[PDB]
């Protein structure tokens, strides 16, 4: 019940962290 | 007062769960628990403060001294402390991140624009996660995301 909600923003988090990524990485190939 | 904004920049579920933490060490009953008691608290819902930090707090929280505090008081300083202690990205390296998410240029992210993100990445990302990270981020609800509204998002992420 409550387990849920701290999985829930636990994979948000995890997304974000992706994003930085995807976004890093893009910004190397720029060269 | 200046409390609904930090009930507002903390998500549905965030909320959902420092209660159940806060009601946990609630045997009055009363939404109150002993100052005594935050610390421990705010360990499990990952902050950690030195107990010199966790000593300040105590003062602002509680001036008048009665060694306790509400719920809302948890709220609007377990989100000062948050961001206090955030380590993410700064501005600069944060607005670049933007732009290469702005395909448009139109001074926003947009539901669209978002999971066109995850797609350079291996994960499966369903529907309502694009909608929920939106949903957190959006804080006007304009919809979509401007700058400003991708930093908190953003604040303190590795
Ligand atoms: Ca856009
Ligand atoms: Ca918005």
């Known amino acids: 019940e409550e387990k849920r909600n701290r999985a829930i923003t636990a994979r948000r988090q995890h997304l974000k962290s992706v994003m930085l990524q995807i976004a890093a990485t893009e910004l190397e190939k720029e060269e | ?158």
Do not use: W
């Open chain 2, 1 to 158: 007062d200046q409390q609904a904004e930090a009930r507002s920049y903390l998500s549905e579920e965030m909320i959902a769960e420092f209660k159940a933490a806060f009601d946990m060490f609630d045997a009055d009953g009363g939404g109150d628990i002993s100052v005594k008691e935050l610390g421990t608290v705010m360990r499990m819902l990952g902050q950690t403060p030195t107990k010199e930090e966790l000593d300040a707090i105590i003062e602002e929280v509680d001036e008048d001294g009665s060694g306790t505090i509400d719920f809302e008081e948890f709220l609007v300083m377990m989100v000062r402390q948050m961001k206090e202690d955030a380590k993410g990205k700064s501005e600069e390296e944060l607005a670049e991140c933007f732009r290469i998410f702005d395909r448009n240029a139109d001074g926003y992210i947009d539901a669209e624009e978002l999971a066109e993100i995850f797609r350079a990445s291996g994960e499966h990302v369903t529907d309502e996660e694009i909608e929920s990270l939106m949903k957190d981020g959006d804080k006007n609800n304009d919809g979509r995301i401007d700058f400003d509204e991708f930093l908190k998002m953003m604040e303190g992420v590795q």
